[PDB]
Amino acid sequence: YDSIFRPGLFDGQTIIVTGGGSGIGRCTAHELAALGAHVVLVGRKAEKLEKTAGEIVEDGGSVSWHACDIREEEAVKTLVANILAERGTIHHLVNNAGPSPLASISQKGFETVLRTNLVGGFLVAREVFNQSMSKTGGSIVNMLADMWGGMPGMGHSGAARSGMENFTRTAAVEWGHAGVRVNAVAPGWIATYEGAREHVPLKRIGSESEVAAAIVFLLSPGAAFVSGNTIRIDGAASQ
Amino acid sequence: YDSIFRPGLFDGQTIIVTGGGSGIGRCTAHELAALGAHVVLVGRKAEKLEKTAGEIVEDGGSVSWHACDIREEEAVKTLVANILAERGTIHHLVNNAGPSPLASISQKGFETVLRTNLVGGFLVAREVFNQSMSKTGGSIVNMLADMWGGMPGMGHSGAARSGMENFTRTAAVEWGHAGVRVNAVAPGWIATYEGAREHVPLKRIGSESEVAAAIVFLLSPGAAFVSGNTIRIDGAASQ
Amino acid sequence: YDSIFRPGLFDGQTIIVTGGGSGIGRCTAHELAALGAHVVLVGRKAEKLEKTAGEIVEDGGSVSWHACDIREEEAVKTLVANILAERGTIHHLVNNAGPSPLASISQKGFETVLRTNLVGGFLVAREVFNQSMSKTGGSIVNMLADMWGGMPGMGHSGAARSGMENFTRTAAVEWGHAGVRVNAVAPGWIATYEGAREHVPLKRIGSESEVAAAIVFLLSPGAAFVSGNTIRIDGAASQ
Amino acid sequence: YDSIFRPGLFDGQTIIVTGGGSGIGRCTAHELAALGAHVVLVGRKAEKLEKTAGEIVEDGGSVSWHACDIREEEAVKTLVANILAERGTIHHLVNNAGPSPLASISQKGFETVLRTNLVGGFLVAREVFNQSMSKTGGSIVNMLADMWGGMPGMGHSGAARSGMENFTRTAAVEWGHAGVRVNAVAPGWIATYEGAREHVPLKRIGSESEVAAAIVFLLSPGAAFVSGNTIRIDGAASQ
C-alpha cells in the first residue's frame, strides 16, 4: 500500500474493521495492515472476509476475521469477547458497515436501515468500550454519509447516519474521560490519490483510498486531540 | 388562551397533534383550538386524550381524539384514514410524541427510543402526506430536542431526534413540490410568556407556551416560505 | 397590514428598524406599525426614510426616522442617544441594513461589505444594549442570508453574514443575563403569503411579508425563550 | 520531527505558512520541512521569521522567509510575486496568522480583528490563487478557532473566524474547478502527541503538534478529495 503514513505507524495494534470484507472497509484494512496493524475484519459474509484476509496475508500483513451479524446484541457481545481472548486489547475500531423516496419507505424498510446504519455500529462501539477501551483508551471512527442537508432519495439512510453522527459526538463527550476518542468520516460520491457526478466542485468522483487515509489519520497519534469530529470526504459537494 | 396570534387564524382547519394529551402537545392543541382549529389529538392513552379533549371542549374549542400506537404502521394507516373520513382534509400535523449513559443502553432500549422518537413520527408524516397532504399542500412540525452537540446522558434520544431533524430536511426537499412545508422545534429545558438550570443565558427554564407559540408560528401563513427549518427554544443554552 | 398577529401586539413599544426605508426593512416596519409599535426607521437616505414614514403615517401608524450611516461609530452613539431622548426606551431592534467571484474581490470591496453587513449591525446592537437594553431587557433580530455552505458568487457577503450569525450567538450568550434575546433571519431568494428560481423545493420565490412575519415572531412574547436562533426563510433551498 | 507521515512526503514542494515564526505556524513549518517541503515563512516580524528559519536550517530543512503585513493588499500582491520569482510554483498555503466582552469592543477594535483574522488570510489566498494556484491546483488550509456556538468573551475573533470558515467553503466551491482544495482547522485550547481546562472531555489541553498534524494531513495526497472541510482539534470540548 502506497500510504502517506510512515511505515510501522500501527505496529502491534489490534484494529477492528466492521464491513471489512469489501469496499472502503477492505481498503482501510489493507492500509492499516500495510502500516503494521493486526486488522480484525468483521462482517456478515465469511466468504469475503476470508478472501480479503487472504489478500492481506499474501501482501505480508497480519489479519483475523469473524463472521458476525453486528445488528444482534448477543452476537456482538461474544464477538468482542472472542477478539479480546485472541488479542488481549483492542486499540481502535472502524465502524464501516452499512434508495427510495420517503413516501415509499415502509416501517420495516426504515427500521432495517436504522439497525444496519446506526444500531449495529452503536453495539460494536458500546461493547468495545465496555469490554476493553474503557480501561485502556483508544479511538473509534464511524462511517457516515453526506446527509448534512438531509438525504433526498435516501431519507432512511440519512436519518440513520445523522443518528450515528450524533452518537459520535455523545460518545466523544461521555467516553473522553477514559482516553477514548470518537470521530466520523462522511464520504460523498466514492467509486486522484490511489494508495491502494459533475456537481462536485473538484469535478471528479472520490476513491476508496481517499476515504481510508482520513480514517487512518483519525486513528493515528496525529489525531490525539481530535474527538467528536467528522471529516467530510466529498470534493466540496456538500457546500 | 392568550395567544400572540389573531383570533380565527386557523378557522376551519384540521390539525393533528400527536402526543396531544399531555405536556407541550396539550398546550399546542389548546392554543390551536383557541385560534379556531379543529384539533385531532393522537396518543397511546385514551384517558388523557379524553381529558384534554374535555378541557378544549369546555374552553369552547373543537376537538377529536384517537387512541393509537403510532409506532405501528398498520395502526397509523388506519388512523389517518379514519381522520380523513371524519374531516376530509388534514391541513397540518404536529409530531409531538416522544436517561442513561451510553454504556448502559441495551439494543432493546436504544431501539425502543428510535421507534418512539423517530419511526413513529416518520410513519404519521408519511401517511398524512400519502393519503392527503401530497394532494393539498400543508405543513408538518416535528418535535426534536437540544441534541446539536450530541445528547450526553441521553444518547439514544439524541440519535433519534438527530434522525428526526434529518428527516425534516429530507421531507422538506422531497415534498416541497406538493406545497408541503416540513419544519421542527428543538426545545431546551422546559418546565416568562404564559399564554396558556442556571447554565441558561436567560437564567430561567422555558414554558410550554414558549414552545407552542413557535410550533403555531411554523403552521401559520407567516411561515409560508419557511421549510426545512428548526427553531431552537432553549434560552440560548445550546450556544 | 394583514398580519397573522393579534392587533395591538406591540402597543406602546419603540422598535428600531435599520434599513427601514426599503425592502424587507420597510415591510417589517409597516407590519410592526400596524401592530401598534412606534417604529424608528434608520438608514443612509433621508428621502426614502421620509417616504416610508409617510406611508406608515397615512396608514395610521406611529413612526420616526433618522438619517445615519451606521457604519460609523460616533454617528451610531449619537443616533441611539437621540432615539432614547425622544422615546425613553428601546424595546426591540431589527438590524436589517445590508456579486463577484472571490478572485475579483479587492481588499476595499471585501472590507466595505464587512462594514456594511457586519460592523454596522454590531455597532447599533452594541449601543442599543449599552445605552438602554442592558437595563431593561429586549430583543434583537439580525438580518443574515443563505450562506450556510458558503456563498459562491457572493463570498464577501457570505463571510460578513456568517460573522453576523456568530455575533448573534455570542450576544445571545453574553447579554442573556440582562433579559436580552438575540436572534437572526436568513432569507433565501426573496422578491404566497402577502400580508403587506426553480432549485427551490417549494418551486417559488419568497415574499417580503414572508420574511417580516418571522422577524415579528422573534420580537414577540411567543419567542420569549428563543435566543441565539436563526430562522431560515428559503423554501428549503438550503437543504 | 517525529511525524506520523512518511519521510519525503512533501519533497520539492513550496508551502507558504503565514504566521510561520511562532506557535502553531512554527510547529507546522518544522513538520513540513522535516517532510521535505521548502517552507516559506511569512509574518509581520522579520526577527522571529529569521529565528524560526534558523532552527529549520539547523535541523536540516529548506526554508525562506518574508517580512510582510498581510493585512495590506499591495504588500501581499508583491509578496506572492516575490515568492513565485524565487520558487516558480506554490503548492500549498497555510493561513495560520491571527479578549473582551462585546459591550466593550470598539469599532476600531472589531475592525482590527476582522482585518487580522479574516481579511489578511483572504488576501493571501486570493493572490496565491490568482498568481499561481488557479493554473496548477494545490491546497489551502485556513486557521480558525472554536467559534461554533459563537465565541463569548472573544466575539470579534469569533465573527472573524466564522467569516473565514465561510470563505473556506466558498473558495472550495469556486476554486475546485482549478484543482484547488480549501480546508480549515479549528483548534480548541492549545498549549499527549508531541512530534515536535477541565471542561474538555479528554481532560487535557492540546499540543501544537496535535494541530500541525491535522494541517499536514489536509495538505497531503491522503486529503485529495477533502475540500470545504474543517477539522476541529478541541478534545471534543465543542460538543
One-character DSSP codes across A80-137: HHHHHHHHS---EEEE----B-GGG--HHHHHHHHIIIIIHHHHHHHHHIIIIIHHH-
- Whether residue B154 contacts residue B100, with contact meaning beta carbons closer than 8 Å, is answered with yes
Q: Which helix (H) or strand (E) holds B31?
A: helix B23-34
How close does chain B come to A166, measured CA to CA in Å?
Answer: 5
Distance from CA of A232 to the nearest CA of C (A): 13
Whether residues D149 and C101 touch (CB distance < 8 A) is answered with no
- DSSP string over C74-132: HHHHHHHHHHHHHHS---EEEE----B-GGG--HHHHHHHHIIIIIHHHHHHHHHIIII
With cell 491546497, the residue in question is D139
CB–CB of B210/B233 below 8 Å?
Answer: yes
Do A169 and B163 lie within an 8 Å CB cutoff?
no
Cell of D27: 510547529
Going by C-alpha positions, the residue among C57, C29, C1 that lies closest to residue C141 is C29
Residues of B in contact with A149 (CB under 8 A): 169, 173, 228
Contacts of residue B213 in chain C, CB cutoff 8 Å? 217, 220-223
Q: What is the C-alpha to C-alpha distance for residues C208 and C24, in angstroms, rounded to an integer?
A: 5
Cell of B59: 374552553
CB neighbour burial string for D19-40, b if at least 16 within 10 angstroms, e if fewer: bbbbebbbbbbbbbbbbebbbb
Domain that holds residue D78: 1-239
Q: How many separate domains does chain D show?
A: 1
Distance, C-alpha C181 to centroid of its chain? 14
List of residues 6+ apart from B161 with CB closer than 8 A: A166, B98, B117, B118, B144, B145, B147, B151, B186
- Matching residue, cell 467516553: A175
Partners of A190 in the β-ladder: A206
What are the phi and psi torsion angles at B175 (to 5°)? -105, -5
Q: CA-to-CA distance for A167 and A124, rounded, in angstroms?
A: 13
Q: What is the DSSP string of C127-166?
A: HHIIIIIHHH-EEEEEE--S-BTB-TTBHHHHHHHHHHHH
* Chain C residues within an 8 Å CB radius of A102: none
- Rounded Cα distance between B179 and B172, Å, is 10
Helices marked H in A3-106 — which ranges?
A: 23-34, 46-58, 73-87
Q: Domain with C232 in it: what CATH number?
A: 3.40.50.720
Where are the alpha helices (H) located in chain D, listed in sequence order? 23-34, 46-58, 73-87, 107-114, 120-128, 134-136, 155-175, 208-219
CA-closest candidate to residue A13, choices A92, A82, A81:
A92
d(CA B177, CA B166): 18
Q: Which one of B202, B220, B234 makes the best mutation probe of the C interface by having the most chain C beta carbons within 10 Å?
A: B202
Q: Which residues of chain B make contact with A80, given a CB cutoff of 8 A? A: none
**Cell digits of residue A99:** 434508495
Three cell numbers, residue D220: 497531503
Pairing of strands B138-143, C14-18: unpaired
Taking one residue from A and the other from B, the number of pairs with CB-CB distance under 8 angstroms is 145
Which technique was the structure solved with, according to the deposited record?
Answer: X-ray
Chain A CB contacts of B72 under 8 Å are 107
User: How far is it, in rounded angstroms, from Cα A76 to Cα C138?
Assistant: 54
Residue D105 identity: I
Instruction: Specify whether the CB–CB gap between B39 and B63 falls below 8 A.
Output: yes
State the Cα–Cα distance between residues B19 and B22, nearest whole angstrom: 7
How many Å lie between the alpha carbon of C179 and the closest alpha carbon of chain B?
Answer: 6
Helices (H) and strands (E) in chain C, counts: 8, 7
Q: How far is B121 from chain D (nearest CA, A)?
A: 27
What does each C-alpha distance from A118 to A75, A160, B97 come to in angstroms?
A: 16, 5, 22
Q: Are C37 and C17 in contact, with CB atoms under 8 Å apart? A: no
Q: Read off φ and ψ for residue D187, nearest 5 degrees.
A: -70, 150
